Amino acid sequence: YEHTAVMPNKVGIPYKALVERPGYAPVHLQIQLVNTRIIPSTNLEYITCKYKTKVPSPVVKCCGATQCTSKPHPDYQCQVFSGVYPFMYGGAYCFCDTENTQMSEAYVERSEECSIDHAKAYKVHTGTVQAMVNITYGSVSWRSADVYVNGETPAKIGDAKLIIGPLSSAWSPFDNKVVVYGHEVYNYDFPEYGTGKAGSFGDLQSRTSTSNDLYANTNLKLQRPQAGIVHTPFTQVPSGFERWKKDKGAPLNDVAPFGCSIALEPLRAENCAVGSIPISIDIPDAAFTRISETPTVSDLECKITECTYAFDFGGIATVAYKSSKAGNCPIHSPSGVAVIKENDVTLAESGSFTFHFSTANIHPAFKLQVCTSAVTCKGDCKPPKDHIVDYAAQHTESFTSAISATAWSWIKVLVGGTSAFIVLGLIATAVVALVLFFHRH
Amino acid sequence: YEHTAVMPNKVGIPYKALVERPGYAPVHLQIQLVNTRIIPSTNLEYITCKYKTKVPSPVVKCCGATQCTSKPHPDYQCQVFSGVYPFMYGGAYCFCDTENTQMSEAYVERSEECSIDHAKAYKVHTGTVQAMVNITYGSVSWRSADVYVNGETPAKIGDAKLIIGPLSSAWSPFDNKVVVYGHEVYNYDFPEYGTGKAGSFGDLQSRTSTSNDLYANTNLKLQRPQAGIVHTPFTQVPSGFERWKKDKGAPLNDVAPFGCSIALEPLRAENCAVGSIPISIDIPDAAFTRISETPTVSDLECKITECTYAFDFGGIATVAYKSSKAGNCPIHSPSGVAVIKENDVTLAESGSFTFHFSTANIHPAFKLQVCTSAVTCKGDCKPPKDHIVDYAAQHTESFTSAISATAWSWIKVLVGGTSAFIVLGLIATAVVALVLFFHRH
Amino acid sequence: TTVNFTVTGEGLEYTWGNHPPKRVWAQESGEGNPHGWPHEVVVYYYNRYPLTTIIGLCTCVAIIMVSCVTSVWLLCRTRNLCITPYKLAPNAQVPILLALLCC
Ligand SMILES: *[C@@H]1O[C@H](CO)[C@@H](O)[C@H](O)[C@H]1NC(C)=O
Numbered sequence: 013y014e015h016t017a018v019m020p021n022k023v024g025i026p027y028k029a030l031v032e033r034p035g036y037a038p039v040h041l042q043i044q045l046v047n048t049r050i051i052p053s054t055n056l057e058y059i060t061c062k063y064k065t066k067v068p069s070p071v072v073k074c075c076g077a078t079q080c081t082s083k084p085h086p087d088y089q090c091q092v093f094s095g096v097y098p099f100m101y102g103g104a105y106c107f108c109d110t111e112n113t114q115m116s117e118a119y120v121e122r123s124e125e126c127s128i129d130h131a132k133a134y135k136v137h138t139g140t141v142q143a144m145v146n147i148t149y150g151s152v153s154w155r156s157a158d159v160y161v162n163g164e165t166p167a168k169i170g171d172a173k174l175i176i177g178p179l180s181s182a183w184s185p186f187d188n189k190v191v192v193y194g195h196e197v198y199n200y201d202f203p204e205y206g207t208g209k210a211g212s213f214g215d216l217q218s219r220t221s222t223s224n225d226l227y228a229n230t231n232l233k234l235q236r237p238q239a240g241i242v243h244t245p246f247t248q249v250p251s252g253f254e255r256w257k258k259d260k261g262a263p264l265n266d267v268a269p270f271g272c273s274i275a276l277e278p279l280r281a282e283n284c285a286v287g288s289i290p291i292s293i294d295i296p297d298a299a300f301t302r303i304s305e306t307p308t309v310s311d312l313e314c315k316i317t318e319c320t321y322a323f324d325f326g327g328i329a330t331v332a333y334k335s336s337k338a339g340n341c342p343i344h345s346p347s348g349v350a351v352i353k354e355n356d357v358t359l360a361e362s363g364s365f366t367f368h369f370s371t372a373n374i375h376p377a378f379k380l381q382v383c384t385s386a387v388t389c390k391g392d393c394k395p396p397k398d399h400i401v402d403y404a405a406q407h408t409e410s411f412t413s414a415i416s417a418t419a420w421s422w423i424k425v426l427v428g429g430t431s432a433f434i435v436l437g438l439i440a441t442a443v444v445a446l447v448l449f450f451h452r453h
Numbered sequence: 454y455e456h457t458a459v460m461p462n463k464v465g466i467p468y469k470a471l472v473e474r475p476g477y478a479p480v481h482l483q484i485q486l487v488n489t490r491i492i493p494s495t496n497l498e499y500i501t502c503k504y505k506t507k508v509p510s511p512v513v514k515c516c517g518a519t520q521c522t523s524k525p526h527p528d529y530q531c532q533v534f535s536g537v538y539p540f541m542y543g544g545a546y547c548f549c550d551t552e553n554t555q556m557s558e559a560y561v562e563r564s565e566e567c568s569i570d571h572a573k574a575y576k577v578h579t580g581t582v583q584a585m586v587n588i589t590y591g592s593v594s595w596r597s598a599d600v601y602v603n604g605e606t607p608a609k610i611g612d613a614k615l616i617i618g619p620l621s622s623a624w625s626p627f628d629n630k631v632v633v634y635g636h637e638v639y640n641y642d643f644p645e646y647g648t649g650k651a652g653s654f655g656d657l658q659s660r661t662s663t664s665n666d667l668y669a670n671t672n673l674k675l676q677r678p679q680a681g682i683v684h685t686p687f688t689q690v691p692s693g694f695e696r697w698k699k700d701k702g703a704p705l706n707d708v709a710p711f712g713c714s715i716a717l718e719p720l721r722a723e724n725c726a727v728g729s730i731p732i733s734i735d736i737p738d739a740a741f742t743r744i745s746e747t748p749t750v751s752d753l754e755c756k757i758t759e760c761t762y763a764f765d766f767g768g769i770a771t772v773a774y775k776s777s778k779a780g781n782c783p784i785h786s787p788s789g790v791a792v793i794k795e796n797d798v799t800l801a802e803s804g805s806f807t808f809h810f811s812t813a814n815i816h817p818a819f820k821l822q823v824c825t826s827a828v829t830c831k832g833d834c835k836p837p838k839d840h841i842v843d844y845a846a847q848h849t850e851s852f853t854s855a856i857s858a859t860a861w862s863w864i865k866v867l868v869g870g871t872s873a874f875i876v877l878g879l880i881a882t883a884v885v886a887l888v889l890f891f892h893r894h
Numbered sequence: 895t896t897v898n899f900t901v902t903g904e905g906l907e908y909t910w911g912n913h914p915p916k917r918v919w920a921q922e923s924g925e926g927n928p929h930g931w932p933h934e935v936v937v938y939y940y941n942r943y944p945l946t947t948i949i950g951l952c953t954c955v956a957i958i959m960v961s962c963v964t965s966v967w968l969l970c971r972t973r974n975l976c977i978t979p980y981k982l983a984p985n986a987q988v989p990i991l992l993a994l995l996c997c
């Protein structure tokens with residue numbers, strides 16, 4: 013039997029319903045999401061990391077001159093400094109006083125840390141949505157499996173076939189461009205490859221951490237060696253990756269709305285409480301028992317013994333009943349006024365049973381279904397004492413949930429009196445208008 | 454010196470321009486696209502191929518019975534056939550006549566051909582655009598490099614840095630979902646994984662060609678073995694992949710608009726002539742010569758000796774000139790009326806030179822920018838004789854390209870005559886009003 | 895069999911089984927003479943721009959008819975106003991210029 017319904021996109025809050033198959037006793041169904049994962053499709057654009065400046069041994073030409081040539085090296089620099097007279101540990105290196113040249117060379121490489129300490133720039137496109145669903149029904153214990161939240165792919169969970177509809181909201185916390193560094197994700201419109209500026213995030217760009225074509229854009233400039241010293245001095249703009257790591261700011265992990273939890277393997281946003289999720293579950297035909305084979309419950313009377321509209325199961329109610337064929341009978345409240353903690357109760361030939369519920373209404377009025385029967389529960393609920401709690405609300409608050417009977421009474425008096433004032437004035441006008449007509453005629 | 458312009462998104466048609474640097478003689482620039490490739494981002498959804506029905510040996514229980522069990526094999530079938538009395542080469546296999554039992558098992562697995570002969574279902578998202586550009590400027594020979602059409606990433610082509618703007622149109626021939634089979638690509642809205650139907654494209658679905666979790670949806674029904682025969686007969690819906698091969702229809706390679714060519718490694722659409730492409734090229738400073746160092750041309754007289762508005766360079770023109778220093782001189786036509794075949798000419802102290810051009814206009818009129826100078830060419834072009842040609846038009850047709858002098862004459866007469874006739878009526882009406890006024894006064 | 899395909903200035907690609915695709919483009923070689931008499935001019939533009947020529951000619955005729963009808967009405971109305979002051983005066987002079995321009 014296929015049961016179709018819509019459940020909210022909430023994690024840790026179970027969805028409860030009664031599967032009512034004509035001719036069979038209701039089968040209690042409970043569907044709880046363990047996690048919801050939005051897994052977008054990503055394409056690695058390039059990898060950024062701290063650069064290393066490689067400086068080969070300078071060519072010191074004594075009594076002569078040399079010339080620089082271009083080479084296929086990132087940010088390659090070459091300059092010939094004439095008029096040098098370097099000294100070594102063994103004395104003057106060159107003979108001529110000024111007819112000597114030192115050719116300095118330098119180029120940018122990926123540092124050793126780039127294998128581990130680097131940021132991956134990704135293009136993010138709409139991907140897939142998956143969830144872990146925990147389901148129990150009738151006398152079948154909790155079973156779970158990974159499912160695809162697409163409304164098409166069915167999943168077999170404990171002999172039951174579950175189809176989870178697509179999320180009503182297509183919202184995703186990732187922008188078209190994200191930067192992944194370590195365990196953190198940043199929404200960052202990184203520069204296109206080959207466009208990174210010196211001292212900025214993209215100063216060093218590589219298509220992959222093992223590529224042999226590196227883009228480097230630093231103001232690497234060779235300076236003249238100090239008088240008499242064989243060395244290759246240079247100036248360069250400090251690494252824009254090191255700068256970025258200082259100024260990264262808040263990661264997406266700390267600013268994603270709806271409480272999303274960001275994971276990287278694969279990149280995904282977990283437990284985003286957005287919209288609702290249509291569902292369809294085909295319950296096995298063996299889970300249903302004929303009406304005549306289940307207990308008949310009658311003379312139901314529901315008394316609310318205690319109630320507070322707290323986020324926990326603050327309500328307590330006692331239901332008196334009369335029955336036959338003592339046995340288990342499911343309990344459910346079809347309306348959103350109250351969420352019942354217990355899923356089923358054991359009924360004797362006569363007596364009473366108690367159940368707990370959570371409600372946001374100051375004067376809750378809800379229907380309670382006891383298998384083949386139902387009763388209406390009414391009462392008053394006190395305000396909760398705790399200002400802050402460490403758990404989410406089980407119930408749902410409606411527009412009129414907070415309006416007390418006293419507030420309704422004042423609204424009725426307001427509208428009734430206000431309307432009567434205008435109505436009486438209009439009637440008086442109509443009566444005098446008729447009298448004036450009869451005066452003329 | 455940066456030169457920016459917009460060139461049409463056409464392959465094999467060169468873009469010509471004169472780079473005019475203040476104080477320096479113009480440098481002829483020619484940019485030609487060799488190919489253009491739209492490379493979308495693709496995610497393999499699943500692999501479809503023809504199924505194989507694996508049938509393990511049947512279990513024959515003589516004088517007894519057996520029970521089937523559930524197994525994870527795809528589309529696994531198990532049925533116990535009682536009352537079997539099989540015979541083999543050695544005679545009756547069982548002693549009992551009707552108390553024997555044969556159990557048959559069957560399941561679906563990927564065929565060997567699925568390693569090679571299978572269809573890949575892909576989800577297609579906006580990716581990247583790349584092109585091969587052939588560039589020559591001044592006296593520099595043709596140079597080419599592969600570039601990214603991002604509008605930001607620069608490319609070094611023969612000491613010149615080229616930046617190509619994004620295509621003016623985001624159009625792509627690939628739909629959101631495509632099926633790649635062999636060398637062909639189909640814009641086929643394939644069913645999601647786990648929802649394929651028997652005898653249809655998705656009857657068998659596998660996430661990868663090596664995946665151990667195979668989805669198979671065929672109406673595989675075990676039949677009762679024939680009387681006295683040990684075998685496992687079964688009925689199954691013919692493979693939906695083989696059925697698809699017959700009905701797959703025309704591939705995207707044959708119906709894609711704009712003449713797009715489809716390639717698979719990577720999946721891409723090539724040479725789609727859609728819109729225009731912005732360009733930005735920095736010509737090296739060494740390419741420019743001071744104006745005072747180049748020839749000065751004067752008394753330019755352009756005579757159209759023959760013209761046909763054919764797709765080829767059917768126009769021929771002669772320009773008489775006088776020039777100092779008798780040097781080389783770039784030739785260009787900035788107006789879109791005609792495209793000049795020659796890039797430059799060799800000038801003497803005095804004489805004339807000829808150039809070829811292609812124009813769509815019946816009465817072309819265009820400015821020919823002889824280096825540092827200009828001459829206006831006007832003429833009459835005859836219609837081409839060839840009805841069909843195997844090469845694209847070298848020129849661009851305009852709205853008024855076909856309007857002849859006689860057509861303009863008739864348009865002017867009709868517009869002028871009707872306008873003049875209207876004015877005559879209005880003037881006569883106003884004049885008579887004054888005549889009547891003077892009658893009273 | 896004989897197969898006829900319409901080819902425009904954009905071009906047409908055709909593939910014959912197992913042969914490489916071939917591309918062809920049509921040139922503006924239609925019949926007519928755009929420099930001749932109206933008969934030859936209309937024929938040329940009709941062959942080159944069938945729909946545009948039909949729309950163009952219909953629009954021109956509409957403009958001509960509207961312009962001619964308006965001008966004829968304006969002149970007929972003007973003439974009545976010019977002669978009425980004298981038609982109601984049997985002994986009026988009826989100036990010679992008015993007799994020639996209005997009567
Ligand atoms: C499903 O819920 C039950 C009870 O809440 C729990 O015992 C079980 O571990 C849950 N399943 C998973 C996968 O956490």
Ligand SMILES: *[C@@H]1O[C@H](CO)[C@@H](O)[C@H](O)[C@H]1NC(C)=O
Pocket residue numbers: 487587588595596597
């Ligand atoms: C560039 O153009 C020249 C001449 O047109 C040609 O020889 C050369 O092969 C072209 N380059 C490419 C990559 O096709």
Ligand SMILES: *[C@@H]1O[C@H](CO)[C@@H](O)[C@H](O)[C@H]1NC(C)=O
Pocket residue numbers: 896897898
């Ligand atoms: C194609 O055109 C020729 C004449 O040009 C004609 O004889 C033939 O019947 C036509 N065939 C089709 C299919 O239009």
